[PDB]
């Protein structure tokens, strides 16, 4: 019955994305410098998230330290020792009073910023990979046991359990409307869910390997994907077809983190060639190389106002580029 | 004084060497997630046994890039289950994110192997040894792993075979000596001597 879907998508193929972007000038060369260098981490780090106030960020490391820093002064405001050394995700709440963490310990710990642990979520059988805050009451988590879960922190029980994946789920992204969220997994398929309906809406299969990162466009009607086959693809929600393939023949390495800017013109991606890339989201052309790390980049985050970007690799160094 | 309290904890990160344990269900990993700690020669080792996740291991094993050593324990008595151990050893040895660190190899329940052989591989017949039967069987089991371990990546990391049973009690000194040799070669590389 999917052959009819393929025929409908072939009939929907009117023109390429680059056919409609001909009548505009390209961006050109985009270069940045390391304004701040953060050296307070001992071991390798895995995850990072920017706050909504664009001043404080949080970094998660594998030595058991969750450090909330100050980006302006390059100094730590909080340093929490973790119960389990192995973590893979973190997120800083939009209200700024909470920060979450999770990893191989099968616990989604929530930390209050008003430092001790607030509550400990235990409903997942696999390792957590990505968690993001809807509000201060409800949180969406994803684990490697093919399950996403909507948690209510006030009761600590799952509201909706999203089970539509066959491979291990790596990342999720939140829409600006805070009503839908797209999630990517290790089965070359990323798909959209409704938090209210509790069911999948659309399924997108365009890649050839494991999806490692995903991010929404600022208008909420598109998303870019990053996978291990050294390619990126831009998908539209309404069209449900591949728009552009940001791929190069000189890269054969994986992609671990992607993020969008405020305008959405510059798609920022973290690769496995010990360096990040910036992409024109319309021209599908290379704009510049972000090479400042001695190890493989594991986290990458762009502020909402777009005035800075933070980037980390497993060499225990966080770098702000601007 | 937040940064002053971290540096002492830095010593707590540096004096302790972490170990990653694998194997199967039949191999005696417990008698040699789960966490254990043991101090030998006033040096603390802290060994991990991940057993709460799924059978797919191509993603979370990237968490163990910076661990000191991987203890791979192999069931040797049941001959039908060696080929899975060979395939797991080849996949571990040929991994991109695991090629720097080294594997200490334990071949468990040797007394059960002796009791079984005193009662699959077509190249066993044309093999000579480098109570006489058990030596040929043991070094066949050793050499089938060592041809994989010396097939590629010999310069970056090494394999340390060990023959042990479930009634052994001296594996702590042996893993201490293996870790001492591994970190000694790493220090000789780091100090511009070799």
């Amino acid at each position, epitope marked *: 019955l999917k052959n009819q879907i393929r025929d409908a998508r072939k009939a929907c193929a009117d023109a390429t994305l680059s056919q409609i972007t001909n009548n505009i000038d390209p961006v050109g060369r985009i270069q940045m410098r390391t304004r701040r260098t953060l050296r307070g981490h001992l071991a390798k780090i895995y995850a990072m998230h920017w706050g909504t106030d664009s001043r404080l960020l949080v970094s998660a490391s594998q030595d058991g330290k969750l450090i909330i820093w100050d980006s302006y002064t390059t100094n730590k405001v909080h340093a929490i020792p973790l119960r389990s050394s192995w973590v893979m995700t973190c997120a800083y709440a939009p209200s700024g009073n909470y920060v979450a963490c999770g990893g191989l310990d099968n616990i989604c710990s929530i930390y209050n910023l008003k430092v001790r642990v607030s509550r400990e979520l235990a409903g997942h059988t696999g390792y957590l990979s990505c968690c993001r805050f809807l509000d201060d009451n409800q949180i969406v988590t994803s684990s490697g046991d093919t399950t996403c879960a909507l948690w209510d922190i006030e009761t600590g029980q799952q509201t909706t359990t999203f089970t539509g994946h066959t491979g291990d789920v790596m990342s999720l992204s939140l829409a600006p409307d805070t009503r839908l969220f797209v999630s990517g997994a290790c089965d070359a398929s990323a798909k959209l869910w409704d938090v209210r309906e509790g069911m999948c809406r659309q399924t997108f299969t365009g890649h050839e390997s494991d999806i490692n990162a995903i991010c929404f466009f600022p208008n909420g009607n598109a998303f870019a994907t990053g996978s*291990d086959d050294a390619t990126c693809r831009l998908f539209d929600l309404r069209a449900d077809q591949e728009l552009m393939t940001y791929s190069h023949d000189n890269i054969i390495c994986g992609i671990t983190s992607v993020s969008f800017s405020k305008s959405g013109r510059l798609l920022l991606a973290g690769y496995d060639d010990f360096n990040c890339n910036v992409w024109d989201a319309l021209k599908a052309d290379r704009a510049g190389v972000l090479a400042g790390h001695d190890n493989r980049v594991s986290c990458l985050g762009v502020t909402d106002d777009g005035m800075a970007v933070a980037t980390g690799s497993w060499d225990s160094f966080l770098k702000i580029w601007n | 004084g937040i940064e002053k309290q971290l540096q002492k904890d830095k010593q707590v990160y540096r004096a302790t060497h972490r170990l990653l344990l694998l194997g199967a269900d039949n191999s005696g990993k417990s008698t040699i997630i789960f966490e254990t700690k043991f101090q030998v020669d006033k040096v603390n080792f802290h060994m991990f046994d991940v057993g709460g996740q799924r059978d797919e291991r191509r993603k979370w094993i990237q968490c163990f890039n910076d661990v000191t050593a991987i203890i791979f324990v192999v069931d040797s008595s049941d001959y039908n289950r060696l*080929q899975e151990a060979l395939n797991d050893f080849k996949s571990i040895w040929n991994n991109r994110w695991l090629r720097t660190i080294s594997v200490i190899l334990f071949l468990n329940k040797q007394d059960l192997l002796a009791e079984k052989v005193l009662a699959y*591989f077509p190249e066993f017949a044309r093999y000579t040894t480098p109570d006489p039967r058990v030596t040929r069987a043991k070094y066949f089991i050793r050499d089938e792993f060592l041809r994989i371990s010396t097939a590629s990546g010999d310069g970056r990391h090494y394999c340390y075979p060990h023959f042990t049973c479930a009634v052994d009690t001296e594996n702590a000194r042996r893993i201490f000596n293996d870790c001492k040799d591994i970190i000694l070669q790493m220090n000789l590389r780091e100090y511009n001597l070799v």
Partner: nanobody
Amino acid sequence: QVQLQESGLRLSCAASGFTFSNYKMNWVRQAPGKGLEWVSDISQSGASISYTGSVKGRFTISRDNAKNTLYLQMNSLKPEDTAVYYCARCPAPFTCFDVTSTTYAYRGQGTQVTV
């Protein structure tokens, strides 16, 4: 969309939806009453070829990129070979763990072969 379809005594596995000469492919079998077991592997260049010792020196595994399919040739069969035969692919290109797994996303549904 990735899709692996088996047929077949010569086995033919058809692969589509992804680039063919950048992945290392595997053959695995599922005999009833037990778990899965690896049979043979083939690299991108077709040079590094290994087999299980129980079936070594008997089977002929091959890959052609122009036809975009994988072939396996059998002679002098045994009654122990009655199993379901999956063609598998470990996911990382230019390189391999989870092909012998309970649930996998890059292998077919398999065909039953009995002598």
